[PDB]
Design an enzyme around this catalytic site. Structure first.
Site, PDB file in Angstrom:
ATOM      1  N   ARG A   7     -26.002  67.454 -67.217  1.00 42.66           N
ATOM      2  CA  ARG A   7     -27.131  67.686 -68.229  1.00 42.66           C
ATOM      3  C   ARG A   7     -26.362  67.431 -69.722  1.00 42.66           C
ATOM      4  O   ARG A   7     -27.250  66.898 -70.395  1.00 42.66           O
ATOM      5  CB  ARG A   7     -27.506  69.005 -68.114  1.00 42.66           C
ATOM      6  N   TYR A  16     -28.266  65.624 -72.658  1.00 42.67           N
ATOM      7  CA  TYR A  16     -28.320  66.151 -74.089  1.00 42.67           C
ATOM      8  C   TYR A  16     -27.992  65.274 -75.269  1.00 42.67           C
ATOM      9  O   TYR A  16     -28.376  65.271 -76.144  1.00 42.67           O
ATOM     10  CB  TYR A  16     -27.717  67.663 -74.146  1.00 42.67           C
ATOM     11  N   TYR A  26     -39.790  73.097 -75.475  1.00 41.87           N
ATOM     12  CA  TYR A  26     -40.391  74.177 -74.510  1.00 41.87           C
ATOM     13  C   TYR A  26     -40.178  75.341 -75.393  1.00 41.87           C
ATOM     14  O   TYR A  26     -38.698  75.506 -75.533  1.00 41.87           O
ATOM     15  CB  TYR A  26     -40.179  74.019 -73.035  1.00 41.87           C
TER      16      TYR A  26
HETATM   17  N1  LIG Z   1     -42.448  80.666 -67.544  1.00 42.42           N
HETATM   18  C1  LIG Z   1     -41.013  81.251 -67.670  1.00 42.42           C
HETATM   19  N2  LIG Z   1     -41.181  82.609 -67.390  1.00 42.42           N
HETATM   20  C2  LIG Z   1     -39.948  83.326 -67.579  1.00 42.42           C
HETATM   21  N3  LIG Z   1     -38.676  82.751 -68.051  1.00 42.42           N
HETATM   22  C3  LIG Z   1     -38.816  81.173 -68.429  1.00 42.42           C
HETATM   23  C4  LIG Z   1     -39.958  80.486 -68.152  1.00 42.42           C
HETATM   24  N4  LIG Z   1     -39.764  79.243 -68.673  1.00 42.42           N
HETATM   25  C5  LIG Z   1     -38.542  79.103 -68.908  1.00 42.42           C
HETATM   26  N5  LIG Z   1     -37.890  80.362 -68.834  1.00 42.42           N
HETATM   27  C6  LIG Z   1     -36.414  80.831 -68.929  1.00 42.42           C
HETATM   28  O1  LIG Z   1     -35.732  79.874 -69.906  1.00 42.42           O
HETATM   29  C7  LIG Z   1     -34.597  79.276 -69.046  1.00 42.42           C
HETATM   30  C8  LIG Z   1     -34.537  77.784 -69.119  1.00 42.42           C
HETATM   31  S1  LIG Z   1     -33.836  77.622 -70.899  1.00 42.42           S
HETATM   32  C9  LIG Z   1     -34.798  77.148 -72.123  1.00 42.42           C
HETATM   33  C10 LIG Z   1     -35.738  78.316 -72.759  1.00 42.42           C
HETATM   34  C11 LIG Z   1     -36.615  77.973 -73.939  1.00 42.42           C
HETATM   35  N6  LIG Z   1     -36.403  77.074 -75.104  1.00 42.42           N
HETATM   36  C12 LIG Z   1     -37.263  79.177 -74.334  1.00 42.42           C
HETATM   37  O2  LIG Z   1     -37.294  79.351 -75.745  1.00 42.42           O
HETATM   38  O3  LIG Z   1     -37.152  80.337 -73.668  1.00 42.42           O
HETATM   39  C13 LIG Z   1     -35.215  79.470 -67.466  1.00 42.42           C
HETATM   40  O4  LIG Z   1     -33.914  79.517 -66.637  1.00 42.42           O
HETATM   41  C14 LIG Z   1     -35.569  80.885 -67.586  1.00 42.42           C
HETATM   42  O5  LIG Z   1     -34.424  81.900 -67.587  1.00 42.42           O
END
Ligand SMILES: Nc1ncnc2c1ncn2[C@@H]1O[C@H](CSCC[C@H](N)C(=O)O)[C@@H](O)[C@H]1O
Ligand SMILES: Nc1ncnc2c1ncn2[C@@H]1O[C@H](CSCC[C@H](N)C(=O)O)[C@@H](O)[C@H]1O
EC number: 2.1.1.-
Lengths: 393, 392
Positions: free
Chosen positions: A66, A70, A92
């Protein structure tokens, strides 16, 4: 001075709707857009807003480190910055929360003398607070990456919230398009058992990613996470919330130094402000309408705005320009470049509105937009109070 | 089933722009809007979006217990819910992060059988991460209310991030239109000195509340917080960020159980992924272009999408309806009420698009909108973070 800028923005978690107005406005203004999003409706939405988009997700691969992905994602964005383009990176959630390439690209851009900014977004933890109906303030919040939690033996507080991210890829450095055999999951459960006991609740949290879906808010015991049928439900978008096990007592020294002094009046450590955290084991029922609540509600009948309250008193022209500065990054850049030229070309501003924009000071803009009463002469809206302070006063 | 709903939404911190699209759409759809915001441009924006708004800020007063204000704010919202109205409460930032009356009103509404939802927003802590260029993941984050921090003696970790909210009203239960003499501020500084030492940095953080303003990101020593000229700069919108003092070593048992096995290959606990936290004392300079970075960048020239990559392949009709479901709460309610009737009335959908909406399943909608290659079929995967010891 230098041509070229990097703005990194978020989409939030739930498809399209959790994007901020300013994230959208930067996506539309960009010369080039690089994006890494979960859901196809958010992807399709972005492509309708800008004609020059690149999907960063294509730089992942099976068995590919990863970190290498990145480095590649960052370099694609910074290459376009160095060619003098206004670049927008889109990730995201919040683009800075558990995101390696955003921080890397912004630091490189900044170090080479380009304009570089991250705009905050709605994180999975923001979603967690909203869907589980908890407040990180009551009673404090510890937030960890699940593998970091284990490897660095991060401390837990049995008195505060615990949130664990990336629980579905414990010890995993690479990527797989079809997801992971989370084979080291049992190592996390062992640590949770040591710290909280086998009977203590763990909430499996998944925020709805599409507008019509419900969140997953499934409570399990630590022990239940060992059942193979349950462990298998934890995936790449799974977050764990572990509620407090007990309530922390007040420090008598601080009670004295903060003059909450009549000690007998300090609430029992078990006393709660309504509502209680519903996820806590042995959650005592809390009265929403205590005599103090009923008396406060009784006062609503004869209520009038206090003399020092400042009613909004603005114009369409002023509301319009303040909206334009928030939603039009090109208009904002023009304003920041020359307050006076910008202010003097805005149609229909009152002389006070024009003067306020020329200065740019918070106070000038507030006086221009709010009637300040003689009785009154920064912002002060605190919308929380700690219970021992509140119940006393 | 019951008439009347409560939706609580946020405005974010920076004027207007940090509101989410869904928060705006609920403010426009509401029968009645109750708001508590900092800045007049956000207030004016809200009043252009709904004709029936009430300012909750008028329920504060000099010497008036904030708890009494919060009871009043909550009751104004729930009274309208009980009369069968679709009510939207609006609070600055995230409406559930250090907010008493949102949680109270939602719990009351829920307990009396009404639809009740909080929509997340951008918090001051979200702003802090963005402006200070830190990631709560590296190396973990402790978040406290400053008075709670002191009264309950909350633990600090010298190895993780510390964030303190409401540092400008330590021990203060009430309100004053002209702000407070934060006279118990020295009690907080005493605790920070015990936990970190007098030389350790504390970042005074104020997010820009207007689009043209710069954030305050002023680094002071714990000792400097005792100078009267500096203490006086801390106000109602001030947050403290305290960086880690040291880096935590790896647990050899977990290294073994997670098979990071060649122990010699595990990075020194001092080894960092670029970039380093600039706020840390004695921050070692980290190389952004190591040989591993240069080799990864060299691979870009010959890069092609992997065979398992799923290109977007959708239609205007499908992107339009998925956008409408996110930005039109009334269209969403109709869809949730009857997937089939809703799906069959959407113009220009392909048969696959129609079928996918009828079901509502994630998978059906993903296949409808993405080309899934044969290689992939033989779960949502988006991991944008890896910690140092794992990654290396
Ligand atoms: N739909 C969702 N519901 C709950 N936790 C989530 C999620 N999508 C991502 N995550 C969390 O985020 C982690 C990825 S790291 C990326 C996080 C993103 N930048 C943010 O702001 O949250 C996952 O392993 C999980 O712990
Ligand atoms: N502009 C700003 N910059 C930094 N911190 C801020 C801020 N505005 C509010 N805060 C923080 O928030 C506290 C009020 S509590 C309300 C927080 C809000 N719901 C949110 O989501 O952030 C303040 O005492 C301060 O700690």
């Amino acid at each position: 001075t230098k041509a070229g800028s990097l703005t990194i923005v978020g989409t939030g978690i739930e498809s399209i709707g959790q994007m901020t107005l300013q994230a959208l406005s930067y996506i539309e203004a960009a010369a080039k857009v690089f994006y890494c999003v979960i859901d196809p409706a958010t992807e399709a939405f972005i492509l309708t807003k800008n004609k020059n988009c690149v999907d960063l997700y294509q730089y992942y691969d099976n068995g590919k480190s990863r970190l290498n992905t990145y480095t590649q994602m960052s370099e694609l964005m910074v290459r376009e910055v160095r060619k003098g383009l206004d670049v927008v990176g889109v990730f995201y959630g919040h683009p800075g929360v558990f995101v390696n390439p955003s921080h890397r690209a912004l630091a490189i851009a900044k170090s080479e003398g380009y304009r570089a900014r991250m705009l905050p977004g709605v994180s999975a933890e923001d979603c967690l607070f909203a869907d589980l109906c908890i407040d990180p303030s009551n009673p404090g919040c510890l937030t960890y990456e699940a593998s970091d939690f284990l490897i660095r033996d991060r401390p837990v507080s049995i008195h505060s919230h615990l949130v664990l991210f990336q629980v579905g890829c414990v010890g995993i450095a690479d990527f797989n398009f079809t997801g992971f055999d989370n084979n080291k999951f049992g190592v996390l459960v062992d640590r949770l058992e040591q710290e909280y006991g086998a009977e203590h609740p763990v909430v499996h949290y998944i925020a709805a990613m599409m507008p019509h879906q419900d969140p997953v808010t499934d409570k399990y015991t630590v022990a239940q996470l060992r059942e193979p049928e349950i462990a298998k439900r934890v995936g790449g978008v799974s977050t764990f919330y572990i509620p407090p096990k007990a309530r922390k007592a007040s420090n008598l020294d601080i009670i004295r130094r903060l003059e909450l002094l009549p000690a007998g009046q300090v609430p029992d450590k078990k006393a709660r402000i309504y509502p209680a955290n519903q996820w806590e084991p042995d959650v005592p029922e809390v009265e929403p309408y205590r005599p103090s609540d009923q008396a406060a509600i009784a006062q609503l009948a004869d209520h009038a705005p206090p003399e020092q309250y400042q009613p909004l008193a603005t114009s369409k022209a002023m509301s319009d320009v303040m909206t334009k500065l928030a939603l039009d990054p090109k208009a904002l850049a023009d304003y920041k470049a020359d307050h006076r030229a910008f202010a003097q070309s805005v149609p229909d501003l009152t002389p006070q509105e024009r003067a306020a924009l020329e200065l740019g000071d918070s106070w000038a803009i507030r006086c221009a937009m709010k009637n300040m009463p003689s009785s009154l002469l920064n912002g002060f809206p605190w919308v929380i109070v700690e219970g021992v302070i509140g119940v006393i006063g």
